[PDB]
mmCIF file of C-alpha atoms in Angstrom:
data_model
loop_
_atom_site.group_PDB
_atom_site.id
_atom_site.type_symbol
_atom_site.label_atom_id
_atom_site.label_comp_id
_atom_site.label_asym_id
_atom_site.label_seq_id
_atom_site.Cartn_x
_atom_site.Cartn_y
_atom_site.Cartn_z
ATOM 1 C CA UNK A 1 7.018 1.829 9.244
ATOM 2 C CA UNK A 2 7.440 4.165 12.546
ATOM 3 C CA UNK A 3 7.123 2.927 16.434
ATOM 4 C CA UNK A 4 5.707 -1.030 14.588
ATOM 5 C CA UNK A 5 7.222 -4.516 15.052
ATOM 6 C CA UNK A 6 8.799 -6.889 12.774
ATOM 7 C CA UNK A 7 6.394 -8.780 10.782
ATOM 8 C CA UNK A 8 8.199 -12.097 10.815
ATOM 9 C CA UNK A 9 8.461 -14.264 8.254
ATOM 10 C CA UNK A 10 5.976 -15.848 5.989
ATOM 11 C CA UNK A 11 3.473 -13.720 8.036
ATOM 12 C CA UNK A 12 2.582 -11.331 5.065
ATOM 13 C CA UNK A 13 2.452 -13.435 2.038
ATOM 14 C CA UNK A 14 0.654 -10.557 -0.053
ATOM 15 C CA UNK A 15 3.301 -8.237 0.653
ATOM 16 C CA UNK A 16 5.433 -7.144 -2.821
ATOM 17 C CA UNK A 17 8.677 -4.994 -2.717
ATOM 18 C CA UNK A 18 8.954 -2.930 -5.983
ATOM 19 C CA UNK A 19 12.198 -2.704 -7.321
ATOM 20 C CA UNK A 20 14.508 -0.364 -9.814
ATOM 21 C CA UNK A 21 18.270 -1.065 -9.219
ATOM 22 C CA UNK A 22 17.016 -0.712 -5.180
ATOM 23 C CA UNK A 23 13.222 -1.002 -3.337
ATOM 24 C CA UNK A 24 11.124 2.040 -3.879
ATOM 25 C CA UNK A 25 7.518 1.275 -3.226
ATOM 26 C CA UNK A 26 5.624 -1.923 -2.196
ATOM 27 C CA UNK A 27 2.522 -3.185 -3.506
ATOM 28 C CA UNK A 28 0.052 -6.140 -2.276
ATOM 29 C CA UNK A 29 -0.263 -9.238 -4.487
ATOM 30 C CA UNK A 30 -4.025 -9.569 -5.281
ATOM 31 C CA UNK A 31 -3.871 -12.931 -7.347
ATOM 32 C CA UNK A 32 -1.282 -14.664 -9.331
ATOM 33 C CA UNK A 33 -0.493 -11.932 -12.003
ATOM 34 C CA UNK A 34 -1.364 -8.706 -10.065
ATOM 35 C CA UNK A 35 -0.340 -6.470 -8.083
ATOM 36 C CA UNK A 36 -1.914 -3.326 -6.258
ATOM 37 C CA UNK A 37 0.165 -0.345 -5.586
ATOM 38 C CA UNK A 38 0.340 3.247 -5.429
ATOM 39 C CA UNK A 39 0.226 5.632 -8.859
ATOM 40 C CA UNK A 40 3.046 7.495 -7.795
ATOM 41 C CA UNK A 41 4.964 4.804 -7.449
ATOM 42 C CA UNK A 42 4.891 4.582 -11.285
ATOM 43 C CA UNK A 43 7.778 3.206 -13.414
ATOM 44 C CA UNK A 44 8.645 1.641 -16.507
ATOM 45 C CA UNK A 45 10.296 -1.961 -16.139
ATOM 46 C CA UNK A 46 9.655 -2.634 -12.366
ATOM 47 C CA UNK A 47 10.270 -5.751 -10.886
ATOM 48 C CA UNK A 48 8.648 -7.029 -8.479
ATOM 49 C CA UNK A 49 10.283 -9.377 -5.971
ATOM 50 C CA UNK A 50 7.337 -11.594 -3.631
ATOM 51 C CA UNK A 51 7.936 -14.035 -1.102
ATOM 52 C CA UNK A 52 11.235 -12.079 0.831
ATOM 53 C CA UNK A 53 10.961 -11.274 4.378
ATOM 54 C CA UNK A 54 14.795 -9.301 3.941
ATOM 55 C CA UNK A 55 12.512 -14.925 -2.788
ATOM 56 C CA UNK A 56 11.110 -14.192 -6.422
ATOM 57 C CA UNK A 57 11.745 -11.870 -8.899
ATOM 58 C CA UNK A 58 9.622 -11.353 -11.610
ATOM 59 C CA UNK A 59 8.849 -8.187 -13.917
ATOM 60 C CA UNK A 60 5.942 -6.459 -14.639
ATOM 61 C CA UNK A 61 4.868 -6.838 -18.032
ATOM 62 C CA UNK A 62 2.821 -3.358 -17.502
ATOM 63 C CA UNK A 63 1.790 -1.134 -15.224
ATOM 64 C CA UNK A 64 -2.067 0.520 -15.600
ATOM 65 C CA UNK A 65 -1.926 3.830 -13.477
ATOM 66 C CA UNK A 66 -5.762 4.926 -12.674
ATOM 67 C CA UNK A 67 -7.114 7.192 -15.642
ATOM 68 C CA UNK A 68 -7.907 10.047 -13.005
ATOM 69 C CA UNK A 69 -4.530 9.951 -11.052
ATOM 70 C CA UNK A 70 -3.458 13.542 -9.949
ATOM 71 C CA UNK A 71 0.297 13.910 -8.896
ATOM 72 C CA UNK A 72 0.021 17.308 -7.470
ATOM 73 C CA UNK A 73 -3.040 16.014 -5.290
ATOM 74 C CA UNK A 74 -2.497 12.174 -5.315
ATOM 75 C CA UNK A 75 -5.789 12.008 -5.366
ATOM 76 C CA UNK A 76 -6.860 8.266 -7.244
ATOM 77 C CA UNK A 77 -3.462 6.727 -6.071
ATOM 78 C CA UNK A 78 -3.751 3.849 -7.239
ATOM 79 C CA UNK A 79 -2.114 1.742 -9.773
ATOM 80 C CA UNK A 80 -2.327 -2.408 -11.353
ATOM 81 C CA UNK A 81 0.996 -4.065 -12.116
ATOM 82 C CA UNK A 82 0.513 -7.195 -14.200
ATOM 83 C CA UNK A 83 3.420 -9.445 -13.626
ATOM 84 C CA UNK A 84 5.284 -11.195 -16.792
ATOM 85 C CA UNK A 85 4.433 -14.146 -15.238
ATOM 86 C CA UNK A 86 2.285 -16.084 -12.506
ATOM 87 C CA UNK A 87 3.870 -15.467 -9.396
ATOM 88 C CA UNK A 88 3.834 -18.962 -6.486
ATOM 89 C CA UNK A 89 3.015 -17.700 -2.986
ATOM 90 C CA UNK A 90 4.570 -20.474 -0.546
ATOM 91 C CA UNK A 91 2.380 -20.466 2.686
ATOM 92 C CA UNK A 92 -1.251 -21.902 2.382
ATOM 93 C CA UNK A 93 -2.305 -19.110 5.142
ATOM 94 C CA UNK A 94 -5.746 -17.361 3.590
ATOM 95 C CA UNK A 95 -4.872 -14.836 0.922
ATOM 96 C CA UNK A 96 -6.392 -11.112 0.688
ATOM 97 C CA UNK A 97 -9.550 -9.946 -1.034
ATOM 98 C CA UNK A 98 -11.041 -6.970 -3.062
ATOM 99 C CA UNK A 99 -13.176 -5.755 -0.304
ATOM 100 C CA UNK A 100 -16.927 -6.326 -1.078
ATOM 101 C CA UNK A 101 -17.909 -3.045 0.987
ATOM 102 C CA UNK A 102 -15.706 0.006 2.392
ATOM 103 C CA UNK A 103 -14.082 -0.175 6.148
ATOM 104 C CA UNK A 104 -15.851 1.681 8.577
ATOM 105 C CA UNK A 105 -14.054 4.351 10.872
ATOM 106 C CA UNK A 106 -12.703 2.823 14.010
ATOM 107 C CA UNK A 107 -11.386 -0.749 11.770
ATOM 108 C CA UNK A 108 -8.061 -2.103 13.064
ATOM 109 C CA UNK A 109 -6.328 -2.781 10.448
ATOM 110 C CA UNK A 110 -2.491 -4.133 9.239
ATOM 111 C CA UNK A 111 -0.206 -1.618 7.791
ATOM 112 C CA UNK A 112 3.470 -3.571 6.616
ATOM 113 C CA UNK A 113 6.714 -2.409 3.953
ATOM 114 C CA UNK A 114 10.158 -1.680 4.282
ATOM 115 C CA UNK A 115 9.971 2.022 4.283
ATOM 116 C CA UNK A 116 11.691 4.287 6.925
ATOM 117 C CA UNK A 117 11.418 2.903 11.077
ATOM 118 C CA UNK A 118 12.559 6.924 11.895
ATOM 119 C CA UNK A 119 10.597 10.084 12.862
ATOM 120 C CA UNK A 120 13.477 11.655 11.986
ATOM 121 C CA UNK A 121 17.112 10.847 10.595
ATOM 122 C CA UNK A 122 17.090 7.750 7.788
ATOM 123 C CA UNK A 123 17.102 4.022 8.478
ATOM 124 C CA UNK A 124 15.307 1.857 6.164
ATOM 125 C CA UNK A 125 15.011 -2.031 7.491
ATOM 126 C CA UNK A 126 16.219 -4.964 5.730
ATOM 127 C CA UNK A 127 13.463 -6.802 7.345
ATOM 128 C CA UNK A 128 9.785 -6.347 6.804
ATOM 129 C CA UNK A 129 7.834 -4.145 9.086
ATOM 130 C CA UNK A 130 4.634 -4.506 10.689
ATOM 131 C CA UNK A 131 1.752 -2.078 12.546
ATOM 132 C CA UNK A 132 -1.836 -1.685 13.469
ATOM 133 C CA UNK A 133 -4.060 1.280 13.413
ATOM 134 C CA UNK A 134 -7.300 1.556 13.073
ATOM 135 C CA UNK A 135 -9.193 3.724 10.206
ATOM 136 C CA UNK A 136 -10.259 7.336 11.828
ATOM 137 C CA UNK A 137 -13.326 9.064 11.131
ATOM 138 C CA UNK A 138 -13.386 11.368 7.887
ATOM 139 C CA UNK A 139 -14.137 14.532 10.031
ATOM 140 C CA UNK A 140 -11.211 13.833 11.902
ATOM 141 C CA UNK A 141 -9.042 13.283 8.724
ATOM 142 C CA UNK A 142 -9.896 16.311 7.078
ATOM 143 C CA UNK A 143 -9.650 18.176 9.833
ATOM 144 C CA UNK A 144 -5.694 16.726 10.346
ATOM 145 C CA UNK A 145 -5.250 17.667 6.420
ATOM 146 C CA UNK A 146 -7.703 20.563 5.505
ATOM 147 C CA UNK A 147 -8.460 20.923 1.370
ATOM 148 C CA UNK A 148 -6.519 17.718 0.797
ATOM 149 C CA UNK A 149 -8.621 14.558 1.764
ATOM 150 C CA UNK A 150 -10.798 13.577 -1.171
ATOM 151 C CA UNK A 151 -13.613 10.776 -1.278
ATOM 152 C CA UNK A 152 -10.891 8.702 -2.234
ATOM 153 C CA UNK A 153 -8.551 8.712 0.843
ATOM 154 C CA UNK A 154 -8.674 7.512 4.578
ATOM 155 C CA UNK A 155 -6.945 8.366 7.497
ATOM 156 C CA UNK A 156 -5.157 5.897 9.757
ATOM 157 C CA UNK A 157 -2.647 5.451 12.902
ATOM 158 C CA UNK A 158 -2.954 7.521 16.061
ATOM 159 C CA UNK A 159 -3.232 11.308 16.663
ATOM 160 C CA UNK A 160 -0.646 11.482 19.228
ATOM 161 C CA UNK A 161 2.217 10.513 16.830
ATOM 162 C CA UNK A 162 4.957 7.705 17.083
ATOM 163 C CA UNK A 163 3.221 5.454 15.000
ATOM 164 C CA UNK A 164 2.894 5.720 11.432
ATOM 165 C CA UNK A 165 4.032 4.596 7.789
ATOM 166 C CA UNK A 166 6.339 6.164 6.049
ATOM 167 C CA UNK A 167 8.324 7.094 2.913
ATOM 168 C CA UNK A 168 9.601 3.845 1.470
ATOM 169 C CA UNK A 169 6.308 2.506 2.511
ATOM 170 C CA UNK A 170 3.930 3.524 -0.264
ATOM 171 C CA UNK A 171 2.220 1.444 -3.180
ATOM 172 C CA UNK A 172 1.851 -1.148 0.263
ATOM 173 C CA UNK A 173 -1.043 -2.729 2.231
ATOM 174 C CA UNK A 174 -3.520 -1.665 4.711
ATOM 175 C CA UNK A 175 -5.041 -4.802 5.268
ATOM 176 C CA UNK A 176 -8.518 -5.198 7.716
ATOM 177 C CA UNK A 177 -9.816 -8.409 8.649
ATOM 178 C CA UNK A 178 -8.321 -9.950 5.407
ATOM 179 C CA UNK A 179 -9.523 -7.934 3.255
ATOM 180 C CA UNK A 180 -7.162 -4.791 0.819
ATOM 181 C CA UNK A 181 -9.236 -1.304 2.029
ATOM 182 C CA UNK A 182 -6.136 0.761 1.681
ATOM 183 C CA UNK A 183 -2.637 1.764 0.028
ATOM 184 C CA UNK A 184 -0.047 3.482 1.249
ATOM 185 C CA UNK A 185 0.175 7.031 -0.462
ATOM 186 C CA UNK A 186 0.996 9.894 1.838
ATOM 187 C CA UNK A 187 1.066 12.270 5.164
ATOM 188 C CA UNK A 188 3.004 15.039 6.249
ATOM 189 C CA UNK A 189 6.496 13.842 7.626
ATOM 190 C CA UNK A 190 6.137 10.214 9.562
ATOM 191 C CA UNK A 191 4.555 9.825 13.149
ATOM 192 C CA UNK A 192 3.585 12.957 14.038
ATOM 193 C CA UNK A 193 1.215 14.556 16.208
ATOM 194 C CA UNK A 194 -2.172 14.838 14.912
ATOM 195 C CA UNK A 195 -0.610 14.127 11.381
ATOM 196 C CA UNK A 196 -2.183 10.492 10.580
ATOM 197 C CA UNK A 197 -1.306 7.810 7.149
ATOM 198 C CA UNK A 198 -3.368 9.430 4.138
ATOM 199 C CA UNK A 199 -4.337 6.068 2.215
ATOM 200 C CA UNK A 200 -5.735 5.344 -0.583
ATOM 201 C CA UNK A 201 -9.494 4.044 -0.460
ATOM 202 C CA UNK A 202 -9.400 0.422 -2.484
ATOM 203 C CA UNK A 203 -13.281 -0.146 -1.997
ATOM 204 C CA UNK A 204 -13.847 3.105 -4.694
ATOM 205 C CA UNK A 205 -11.775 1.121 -7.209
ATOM 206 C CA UNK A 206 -12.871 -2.387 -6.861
ATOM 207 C CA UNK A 207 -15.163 -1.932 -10.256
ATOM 208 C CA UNK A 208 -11.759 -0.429 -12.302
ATOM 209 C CA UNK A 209 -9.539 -3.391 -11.157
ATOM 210 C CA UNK A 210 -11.643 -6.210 -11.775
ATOM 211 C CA UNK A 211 -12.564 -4.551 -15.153
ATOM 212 C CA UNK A 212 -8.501 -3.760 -15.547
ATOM 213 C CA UNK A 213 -7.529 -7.342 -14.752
ATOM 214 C CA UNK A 214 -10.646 -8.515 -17.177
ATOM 215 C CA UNK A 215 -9.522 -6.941 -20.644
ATOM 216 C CA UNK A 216 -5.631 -7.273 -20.089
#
């Protein structure tokens, strides 16, 4: 996360770090035994660790990438990790929903991980990371990214740069008035100028999760 503030702890309870010998991705935890994150952030044998700010580990017993995923395009970037077992949030805060209808343009919105706090150069936090931004209009967002924004994305953040996700960020929350509209997936570079967060759009998917969490 570029040009946001640290979250605190126990602040984002939902908030998952995905891990392979060093955190990748994150993900949001939508009940007990799943997860939300991105497609491309696709592995075999994650673990997930919940609960730490800079704490539980538990692996995923499988990951279910969307059926329609494209990697060059990453359109349908989505993916469900079911965890080996149930994970135990710790703060009786309100948890995160499905969202029962899509976000409309103009939605503030909270947008957290551990990814990259730098425009440019590298420094990745050791403490979770916090911003909000508000959803922008699709005719802005395609204009920003022509050919590339499908039904299936949203634009967020600000079109004068400085604030923005960013890589180390994806597979993680965009979270609006407690309810999961959006993952982390991509943009081009971090924080700049009239270059918004691409996310993925969780209200087009609500049908394939519940169904996804149903038969496994």
């Amino acid at each position: 996360i570029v040009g946001g503030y640290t979250c605190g702890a126990n602040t984002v309870p939902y908030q998952v770090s995905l891990n392979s010998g060093y955190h990748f991705c994150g993900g949001s935890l939508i009940n007990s035994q799943w997860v939300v994150s991105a497609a491309h952030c696709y592995k075999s044998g994650i673990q997930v660790r919940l609960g730490c700010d800079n704490c539980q580990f538990i692996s995923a017993s499988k990951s279910i990438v969307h059926p329609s995923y494209n990697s060059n395009t990453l359109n349908n970037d989505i993916m469900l990790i079911k965890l080996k077992s149930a994970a135990s949030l710790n703060s009786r805060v309100a948890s995160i929903s499905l969202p029962t209808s899509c976000a409309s343009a103009g939605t503030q919105c909270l947008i957290s991980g551990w990814g990259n706090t730098k425009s440019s150069g590298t420094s990745y936090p050791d403490v979770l990371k916090c911003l909000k931004a508000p959803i922008l209009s699709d005719s802005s967002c395609k204009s920003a990214y022509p050919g590339q924004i499908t039904s299936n994305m949203f634009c967020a953040g600000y079109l004068e740069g400085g604030k923005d996700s960013c890589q180390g960020d994806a597979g993680g929350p965009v979270v609006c008035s407690g309810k999961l509209q959006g993952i982390v997936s991509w943009g081009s570079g971090c924080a700049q100028k009239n270059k918004p967060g691409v996310y993925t759009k969780v209200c087009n998917y609500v049908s394939w999760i519940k169904q996804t969490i149903a038969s496994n």
